Amino acid sequence: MEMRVLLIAGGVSPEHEVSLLSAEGVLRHIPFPTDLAVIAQDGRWLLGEKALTALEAKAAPEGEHPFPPPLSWERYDVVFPLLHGRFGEDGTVQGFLELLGKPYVGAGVAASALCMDKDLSKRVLAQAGVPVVPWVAVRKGEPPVVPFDPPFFVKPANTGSSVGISRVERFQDLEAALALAFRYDEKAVVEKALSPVRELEVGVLGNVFGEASPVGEVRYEAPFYDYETKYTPGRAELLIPAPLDPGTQETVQELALKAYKVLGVRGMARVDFFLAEGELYLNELNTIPGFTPTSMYPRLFEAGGVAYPELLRRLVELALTHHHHH
Amino acid sequence: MEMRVLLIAGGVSPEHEVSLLSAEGVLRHIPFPTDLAVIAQDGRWLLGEKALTALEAKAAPEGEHPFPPPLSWERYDVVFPLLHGRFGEDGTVQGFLELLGKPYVGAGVAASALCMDKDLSKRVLAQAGVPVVPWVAVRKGEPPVVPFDPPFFVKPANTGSSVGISRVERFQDLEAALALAFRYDEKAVVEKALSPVRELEVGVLGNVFGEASPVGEVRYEAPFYDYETKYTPGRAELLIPAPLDPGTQETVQELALKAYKVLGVRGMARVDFFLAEGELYLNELNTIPGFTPTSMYPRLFEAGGVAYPELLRRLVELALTHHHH
Ligand SMILES: Nc1ncnc2c1ncn2[C@@H]1O[C@H](COP(=O)(O)OP(=O)(O)OP(=O)(O)O)[C@@H](O)[C@H]1O
Ligand SMILES: Nc1ncnc2c1ncn2[C@@H]1O[C@H](COP(=O)(O)OP(=O)(O)OP(=O)(O)O)[C@@H](O)[C@H]1O
Numbered sequence: 255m256e257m258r259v260l261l262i263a264g265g266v267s268p269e270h271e272v273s274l275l276s277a278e279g280v281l282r283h284i285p286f287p288t289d290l291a292v293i294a295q296d297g298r299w300l301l302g303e304k305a306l307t308a309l310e311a312k313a314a315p316e317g318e319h320p321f322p323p324p325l326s327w328e329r330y331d332v333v334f335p336l337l338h339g340r341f342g343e344d345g346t347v348q349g350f351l352e353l354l355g356k357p358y359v360g361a362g363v364a365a366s367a368l369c370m371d372k373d374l375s376k377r378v379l380a381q382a383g384v385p386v387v388p389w390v391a392v393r394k395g396e397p398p399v400v401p402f403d404p405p406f407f408v409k410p411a412n413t414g415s416s417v418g419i420s421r422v423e424r425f426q427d428l429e430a431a432l433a434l435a436f437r438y439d440e441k442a443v444v445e446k447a448l449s450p451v452r453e454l455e456v457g458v459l460g461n462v463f464g465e466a467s468p469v470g471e472v473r474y475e476a477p478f479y480d481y482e483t484k485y486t487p488g489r490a491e492l493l494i495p496a497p498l499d500p501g502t503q504e505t506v507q508e509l510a511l512k513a514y515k516v517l518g519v520r521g522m523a524r525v526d527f528f529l530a531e532g533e534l535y536l537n538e539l540n541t542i543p544g545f546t547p548t549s550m551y552p553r554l555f556e557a558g559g560v561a562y563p564e565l566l567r568r569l570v571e572l573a574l575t576h577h578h579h580h
Numbered sequence: 581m582e583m584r585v586l587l588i589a590g591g592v593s594p595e596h597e598v599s600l601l602s603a604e605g606v607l608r609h610i611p612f613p614t615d616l617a618v619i620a621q622d623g624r625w626l627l628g629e630k631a632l633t634a635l636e637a638k639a640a641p642e643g644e645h646p647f648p649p650p651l652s653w654e655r656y657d658v659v660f661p662l663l664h665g666r667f668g669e670d671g672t673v674q675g676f677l678e679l680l681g682k683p684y685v686g687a688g689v690a691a692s693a694l695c696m697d698k699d700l701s702k703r704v705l706a707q708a709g710v711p712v713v714p715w716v717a718v719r720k721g722e723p724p725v726v727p728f729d730p731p732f733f734v735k736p737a738n739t740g741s742s743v744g745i746s747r748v749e750r751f752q753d754l755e756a757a758l759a760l761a762f763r764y765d766e767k768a769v770v771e772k773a774l775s776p777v778r779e780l781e782v783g784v785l786g787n788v789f790g791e792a793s794p795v796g797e798v799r800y801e802a803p804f805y806d807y808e809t810k811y812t813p814g815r816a817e818l819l820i821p822a823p824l825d826p827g828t829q830e831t832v833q834e835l836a837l838k839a840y841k842v843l844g845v846r847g848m849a850r851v852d853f854f855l856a857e858g859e860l861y862l863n864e865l866n867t868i869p870g871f872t873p874t875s876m877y878p879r880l881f882e883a884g885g886v887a888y889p890e891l892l893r894r895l896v897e898l899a900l901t902h903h904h905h
């Protein structure tokens with residue numbers, strides 16, 4: 255096999271360990287020769303055996319090479335940026351790879367930045383006619399103006415793995431929840447809490463003609479789908495396909511493929527939905543979904559007849575068929 | 581306090597020559613020690629004296645160092661990216677500076693990529709309640725669907741300096757206008773042409789919560805505010821403050837700062853407006869406006885009491901206020 259892929263995992267985001275968990279899942283199944291590069295939590299890079307060493311530790315606090323790393327970029331045909339969250343999924347790493355001229359897996363700069371921002375993405379989706387949960391954006395220092403009644407969900411505008419997210423019951427608790435989210439981002443969203451709710455997720459694969467995976471449902475007993483529930487094995491109940499009627503599942507896939515085109519995503523995406531009182535709401539769209547043992551995106555496509563190595567192979571091919579079209 | 585600025589100009593976008601003119605304006609008024617780095621049209625970088633030599637030539641087709649350049653970044657305290665257009669104003673260069681850790685003038689990755697897309701910005705601004713011109717997006721290869729009557733304006737979605745823009749009077753001319761636009765971007769926008777139209781411009785300075793300049797109005801005798809009109813001296817008149825009705829100036833400034841806040845722009849932006857039949861429309865936000873001799877952003881704030889050196893001082897200063905957060 256002549257194809258050579260550079261996998262980049264880790265990062266300075268709070269999802270650093272999740273990224274390393276995703277690297278292990280991709281390295282186990284990718285059918286091409288693949289080297290790993292790890293971004294440590296201090297921003298410095300680890301290469302070669304030191305990157306594989308940090309992968310066994312499932313955490314990399316300190317690195318060796320400051321950015322830009324002395325990496326032989328001409329060795330690799332495709333770069334796989336497996337960096338969840340800030341400085342990896344928000345367009346920053348994508349912009350660096352665009353200047354290197356390398357083909358890379360996943361969405362481009364604008365689509366990565368647009369989808370990581372829980373406020374700007376909802377504005378675009380609401381403008382295209384996609385149903386979303388009522389919300390408002392709160393900037394740091396600016397007092398909150400919430401035109402709907404609690405319960406709320408307070409999130410950092412650019413977050414992942416449910417980090418910094420709080421379920422708020424009384425308006426008294428809003429200022430403390432906003433202060434937690436402001437630890438992770440200068441901007442936060444306050445969303446109306448759907449109670450009760452079912453959580454549905456669909457994977458999308460493709461550049462121009464994206465195709466949807468079967469609809470899956472996630473169930474749990476924690477207050478919400480939080481960090482511990484997402485990544486502790488066995489804590490989350492992953493139901494594929496979702497025990498819904500076919501009509502709702504078809505509508506979920508229709509909405510996912512539409513949001514995929516509206517937001518300009520290419521490569522891949524996991525689209526999360528809320529089902530409450532028969533009404534569908536698009537929650538978010540993740541351009542670099544997790545590939546951890548408890549993650550949903552790889553399982554969603556295996557049920558659809560696309561095995562784990564076939565999914566990763568099509569991700570790498572899509573990065574090349576997009577690059578050739580300039 | 582020590583302050584050494586690295587100025588980056590040139591670039592691979594069609595506005596390459598315009599960027600070098602902006603660098604000459606910035607270097608003539610910036611109050612800090614400032615080195616120049618030139619990105620040639622081939623993507624390779626020119627450093628030091630070769631960057632100054634290419635500045636005198638007003639064009640740099642070929643460069644020396646492939647990306648990333650062997651630049652001594654540690655020598656500089658703020659990076660001033662002055663690259664108009666794609667690969668400079670659209671978040672790509674900003675992402676490299678973020679990973680670099682050096683503070684930089686202007687909008688971040690998200691705000692740059694959003695303002696540089698004439699379709700994405702209009703989607704966000706229309707949802708936020710900002711009035712915008714009726715528009716539609718066309719992808720290269722897809723057949724267009726323009727649900728409104730001509731005249732149109734056809735634009736590359738990522739264009740600047742009126743490059744690739746056509747005024748379309750007949751439907752039989754749409755195909756040629758799209759083929760022209762698709763030379764510069766894989767996505768194009770088709771907008772309902774306002775005729776007649778007055779053009780208003782207002783500058784913003786600040787991080788997210790901006791400070792608005794006086795409103796200025798551009799006059800010209802060309803068919804539209806095209807490339808030759810934008811950069812040939814004397815072809816464009818700037819009337820400050822714009823001859824506007826009571827409260828109309830305030831409304832323009834309110835919309836400018838509102839779009840600035842929604843999109844979360846940092847540093848600066850020039851916000852362009854259309855005035856047609858008493859109605860206001862938001863045209864675009866340019867995060868890296870021109871600093872060329874005929875550009876309006878320094879003149880808008882000069883009329884507001886912020887001189888050219890003070891304007892550049894606050895821009896460098898705002899880059900550190902965000903970085904120190
Ligand atoms: N409006 C809401 N109503 C009910 N529950 C919500 C709402 N918003 C968020 N939640 C709960 O909080 C969890 C996290 O929400 P969200 O998907 O925004 O977090 P995230 O970190 O972006 O997720 P991911 O890890 O997929 O990126 C959801 O799985 C859901 O269970
Ligand atoms: N919808 C419209 N109706 C009427 N005139 C228009 C319209 N769109 C563009 N124009 C004319 O074309 C010119 C350029 O439009 P636009 O500002 O979109 O180009 P640009 O390349 O973004 O300009 P800049 O150099 O400010 O970036 C405008 O100044 C205006 O004169």
Ligand SMILES: [Cs+]
Pocket residue numbers: 369370371538539540541
């Ligand atoms: Cs996201």
Ligand SMILES: [Cs+]
Pocket residue numbers: 388389390
């Ligand atoms: Cs809203």
Ligand SMILES: [Cs+]
Pocket residue numbers: 695696697864865866867
């Ligand atoms: Cs713009």
Ligand SMILES: [Cs+]
Pocket residue numbers: 715716
């Ligand atoms: Cs539209």
Ligand SMILES: [Mg+2]
Pocket residue numbers: 413414415538539540
């Ligand atoms: Mg998410």
Ligand SMILES: [Mg+2]
Pocket residue numbers: 526537538
């Ligand atoms: Mg989620």
Ligand SMILES: [Mg+2]
Pocket residue numbers: 739740741864865866
């Ligand atoms: Mg512009």
Ligand SMILES: [Mg+2]
Pocket residue numbers: 852863864
């Ligand atoms: Mg303009």
